[PDB]
Design a protein around this nucleic acid. Sequence first.
RNA 1: AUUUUU
RNA 2: AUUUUU
RNA 3: AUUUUU
RNA 4: AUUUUU
RNA 5: AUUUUU
Lengths: 192, 60, 202, 239, 37, 37, 95, 257, 66
Amino acid sequence: TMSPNELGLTSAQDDGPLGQEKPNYFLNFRSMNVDIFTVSHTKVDNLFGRAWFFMEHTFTNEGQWRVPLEFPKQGHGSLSLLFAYFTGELNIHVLFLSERGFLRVAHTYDTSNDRVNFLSSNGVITVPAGEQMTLSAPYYSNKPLRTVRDNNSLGYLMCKPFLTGTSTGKIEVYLSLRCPNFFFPLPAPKVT
Amino acid sequence: MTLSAPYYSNKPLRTVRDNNSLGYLMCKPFLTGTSTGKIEVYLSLRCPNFFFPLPAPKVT
Amino acid sequence: VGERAFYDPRTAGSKSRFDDLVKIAQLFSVMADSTTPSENHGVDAKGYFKWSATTAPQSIVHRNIVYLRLFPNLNVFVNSYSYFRGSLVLRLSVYASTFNRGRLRMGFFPNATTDSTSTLDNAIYTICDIGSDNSFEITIPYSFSTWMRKTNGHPIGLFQIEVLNRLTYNSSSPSEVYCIVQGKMGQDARFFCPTGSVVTFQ
Amino acid sequence: MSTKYKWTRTKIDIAEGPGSMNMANVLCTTGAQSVALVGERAFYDPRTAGSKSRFDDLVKIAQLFSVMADSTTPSENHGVDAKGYFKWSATTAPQSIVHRNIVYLRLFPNLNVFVNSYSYFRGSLVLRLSVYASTFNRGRLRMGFFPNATTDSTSTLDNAIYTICDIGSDNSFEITIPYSFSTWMRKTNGHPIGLFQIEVLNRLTYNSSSPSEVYCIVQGKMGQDARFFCPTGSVVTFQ
Amino acid sequence: MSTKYKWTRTKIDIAEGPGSMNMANVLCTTGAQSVAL
Amino acid sequence: MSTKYKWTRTKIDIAEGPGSMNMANVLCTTGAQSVAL
Amino acid sequence: TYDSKLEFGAFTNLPHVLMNLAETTQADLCIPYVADTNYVKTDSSDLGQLKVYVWTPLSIPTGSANQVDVTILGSLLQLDFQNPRVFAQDVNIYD
Amino acid sequence: VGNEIGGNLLTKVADDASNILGPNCFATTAEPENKNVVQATTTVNTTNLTQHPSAPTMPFSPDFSNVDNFHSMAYDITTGDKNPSKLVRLETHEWTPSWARGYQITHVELPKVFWDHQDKPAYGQSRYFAAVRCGFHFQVQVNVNQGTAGSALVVYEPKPVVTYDSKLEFGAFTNLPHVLMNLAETTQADLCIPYVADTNYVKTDSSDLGQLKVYVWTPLSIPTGSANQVDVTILGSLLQLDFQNPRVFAQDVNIYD
Amino acid sequence: VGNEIGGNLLTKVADDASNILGPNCFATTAEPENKNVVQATTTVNTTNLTQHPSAPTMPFSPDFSN
RNA sequence: AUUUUU
RNA sequence: AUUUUU
RNA sequence: AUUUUU
RNA sequence: AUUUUU
RNA sequence: AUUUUU
């Protein structure tokens, strides 16, 4: 039968270990699980499998664009802030808004700003002018886990546009992740 | 493009008449220069579930 | 070579990654937590107030309209998903001494909006008798006109904790104690559509 | 081994039309991409609608009766108008007309909708005349129909598809009009369905405590063999 | 398991002619799209 | 049944070169389209 | 690192022990190696730190004592020293 | 007999007065989560007694193996443990030419020499224990060019010998674990010495358990051109080590009577 | 459900993170010697009721045959 | 690592 | 020349 | 007309 | 309606 | 929900 513990009478100091799926009941009530969709939208793989805006860059020259990729404190991706460590594939969505040209895109977890000066083997995919691509950067990190908060939690993204004439433009970037491994959930964030 | 939006409604059924019977559509164009234009929109539905037929409509 | 890497959970002290987020929504968090207890006899949203001997046998120690955003953990999902469903669990923890004794009835009127003290005889209530386990709970079954409700829209209901029996004490025990109200999702909790954000975290 | 050839990706020729959007074939639209989080489907709830299943075929709606050219007031021209709401009066001679007009699908609320949706159709049409008299009133009324007729003029119905109505307990007589056109499919909005005439056969009799004239209602629907074919543009705007 | 490689969509090379319309071969026209309901 | 997912057409990635015409490999030319009836 | 950015009252998400005085006199916490690096530099604050906060202030009656002491004891479930080095010399295992 | 029956005297009553709608009340009684128990925990030479314990906590689906499966540190897991038994340089003196036979080249305080400086692998632990019982493995190294010749006596002298050293006849020291090593023939000597004393344990940081010495069997015969700076080095390893008695940091404790 | 698990939630954890040197910690939980019981003793026409009894004592290997 | 889908 | 992948 | 490839 | 091709 | 097609 039902114990008084499952009827509401408990002790907060006896909750450890963390993660106790204890059932709560009372007459005329029982946990009822009803599904509306064929699958879950709470699963990490599904939720995060959907991109979210990151930032935009307006180029004028053929200079390079180096930016510390990090988890959002803004979109639905904020749900990541509930975790401390991450590891797995990273999907980067880049939109190359230009009349005539090409956009070199690369990604690395390497902090050194000189290993990027060349782009030899940092994944120089080419998005023709007015096009957009979605490259999935592997976990080529030198650290087993990525603190989820760091201003560079995610590796740096590089964008060296190869323009042809006076043409200029802007590169909007949004991103998601493929199968994410989050660990050791931390306390909920505050609001600004 | 032709995107198929799922029934992500908070209401089990959509009164068919409502000025918002179907969910709202959003369009935020990302332009580059002074370029401007127009966005024509047409639509259909995939497998529709209609219920409780009501009387025929009037004419204007 | 378009391949994959071998992940290392051990360095995180875990044996496996975290697959479902709902489990986080099922973790208690203080409601409208503050540094100081309710200075309005608990008539505010502060989930941190005081149970005092003075308070009449029917006076209110805390009353307010509950929203998911009033909870740290939940407020995150509120800013992520558009809808949800499932039961909500609130756990009141009164921290008194081993000498203090008394009862307190906390009820809840689902989807109620009028923030006003009212008899809880018809509301979903739980009577709390002070003892060794001073952390009573209360479950609120999903209740809406729809199969799925807005994560940020209509209130969850009216939450009221009235005094049933004056907090008793003695020469060496406190005449008033502190209380904490936590909130989490039930085992049947679910979230559905992810929507835009209504706030920015830090 | 096939190492005599350098491995390469498959090469394919792209047919006419780069991003041609077919908004005519359903087989095309149903295959469109999904903005769903995981491209899945939802569980529908018919109960909230009080139904056990969704509505799959529209033809069934076209098979639902609707008043013809319905009005607030009965025909003020002895029924010589399109109003499917007129009066059967004792005064009317044993051969005079109580109602006459050319019938079109658009004259019916339900049907008029299909008329503004589909371009063609086929099948039989059923008209049901409901005379509302008292239990004392008695008499007969013959309603005929000349298919595809266009001359709106009273004429002997001896050769027309007619139905004699003898007032009793069930005062709602019908009349079916089999598909009749030079084609296997006819315009939903074009040539008339025919001439509809309801002549008096036997003067409506009455007594001291019964009405000397009664009200009549004409409804119309499609037969069990009804069909609609091509969807076309609209000729009117609903509200 | 083939989990040593990140799953991806098939990649294919598009032959000469972007929207070249062949109005000579019947085998080409009969395969055209249908505006039928 | 696979009715847990909305049926859709296959999606594929198009390799480098939009209408690149290979006039070097015979295996490429012999596969060209036919203007034959 | 980001302590001020976190909402108190949610810290219950971390291995903790809300311990109600007058009920419990000791709390037990088993914490495994947790870091974003396989190894932590000896003599470092890395690998986090254990803290004790005020859930609800002390309600000390008039006559009752007013000097409550909080003590933290620690044991190593498992220890592992690998990199050799001079005596207590700061060495960087990190990049 | 009473005072707990609250569950089946309310659960049954309703079950007895229930209609098609079922019981209108359910009552369950049991023991509180906070029961009257006592917990005891023991770590190395410690015992924690608590009479007001609480449910122990821990992270989600935790892994306490504490072993890095990637081995970011390629070493044996027991490296730190065995570290103090590691081979180390105990001494290095210079064989000053013109030193008659019997002359003592260099000595070494056994066993406190293994904690000679704070830079000794064993220095760490040695400080937290007053008692020691260990075995030794010495390797006295002496290198000399081929042109030169000579011989040294590497011998282990227990406290008994060290005490009465002058009373013993040199040339008989060959009775002790030694290595008459003839230069120009051998460059290193090996000596395996077990725990030798008149007491089960020796006080840490003591010269007890004897000491290893190196004497001049036959003086160095260095030709004219040949080099004249011969160095004698003493290396030591602990075949087996054992620290027992706990004590304050490096505080002289008397294990003896 | 809690408040006693102090023994196998510490005894096991170590038993799970132990090396060749064995566990570095052992924890055992149980009831105190002074439990909540009541003792009753009856002599000729007398009854002694005590609610705070203690372990009865007696001499070494005693003989009560008298 | 059914850590694309069954 | 499993010198595309197993 | 293995006169796409084996 | 092998009324795409065999 | 053969609520893509048979």
